[PDB]
């Protein structure tokens, strides 16, 4: 996030980090319950990658984080990599997350929910802060 | 990438207004936000775009794509969850 600010630790409990076996953060995701994570199809997640929950500072060794293994990768069959349309992939955890004060689920909207132009929302992540 | 989790507030735009920047690349299962001085960037992909509705934070978009330079004056593009939630429900029910 360019021009963002540091979050209050644990205040976005559904935010997870997708990291490869090397420990390298490459994408974000959101917990929708203790066994499923929603992420982007273009992230190209495989079952060798790990879902890290409860993390705030990726450079810290003293956070009680949860490194969860991925059982399956469900790439939306309608995803079009040429247009990046329907960019969603669901991840089924082989090991369920343990919900706590710092790990919980975000709500999903109803297909008929209206979110008007001009509404201020929030986006979170560990992406580049300067490009 | 930063060690600590970042956050940013940003406005949602209409797909019509967003097409003024991206033209026909803006499809129905996409929702735009930003062009407000902040920008999602590389490494943010797959993360959430949440809006508070009736007191709870709800997932409106998934960080998807945007300016190759993460320009804070161009709208960022997110997968519109409202157009994909029925698939999420089917997938969860069957597996």
């Amino acid at each position: 996030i360019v021009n963002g600010e540091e979050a209050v630790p644990g205040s976005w409990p559904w935010q997870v980090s997708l990291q490869d076996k090397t420990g390298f953060h490459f994408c974000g995701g959101s917990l929708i319950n203790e066994n499923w994570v929603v992420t982007a199809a273009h992230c190209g997640v495989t079952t060798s990658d790990v879902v890290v929950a409860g993390e705030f500072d990726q450079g810290s060794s003293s956070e009680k984080i949860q490194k969860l293994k991925i059982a399956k990768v469900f790439k939306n069959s309608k995803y079009n990599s040429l247009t990046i349309n329907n960019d969603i992939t669901l991840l089924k955890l082989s090991t369920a997350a343990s919900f706590s004060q710092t790990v919980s689920a975000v709500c999903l909207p109803s297909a008929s929910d209206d979110f008007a132009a001009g509404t201020t929302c929030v986006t979170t992540g560990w992406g580049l802060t300067r490009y | 990438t930063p060690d600590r989790l970042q956050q940013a507030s940003l406005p949602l735009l209409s797909n019509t207004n967003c097409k003024k920047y991206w033209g026909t690349k803006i499809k129905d299962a996409m929702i735009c936000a930003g062009a407000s001085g902040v920008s999602s960037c590389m490494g943010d992909s797959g993360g959430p775009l949440v809006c508070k509705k009736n007191g709870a934070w709800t997932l409106v978009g998934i960080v998807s794509w945007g300016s190759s330079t993460c320009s804070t004056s161009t709208p960022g593009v997110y997968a519109r969850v409202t157009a994909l939630v029925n698939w999420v429900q089917q997938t969860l029910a069957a597996n």
């Binding site: 644990g10 205040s11 709500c107 | 956050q7 934070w57």
Partner: peptide
Amino acid sequence: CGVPAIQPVL
């Protein structure tokens, strides 16, 4: 869902 135990500060 959607209600964090630790409130975000924006």
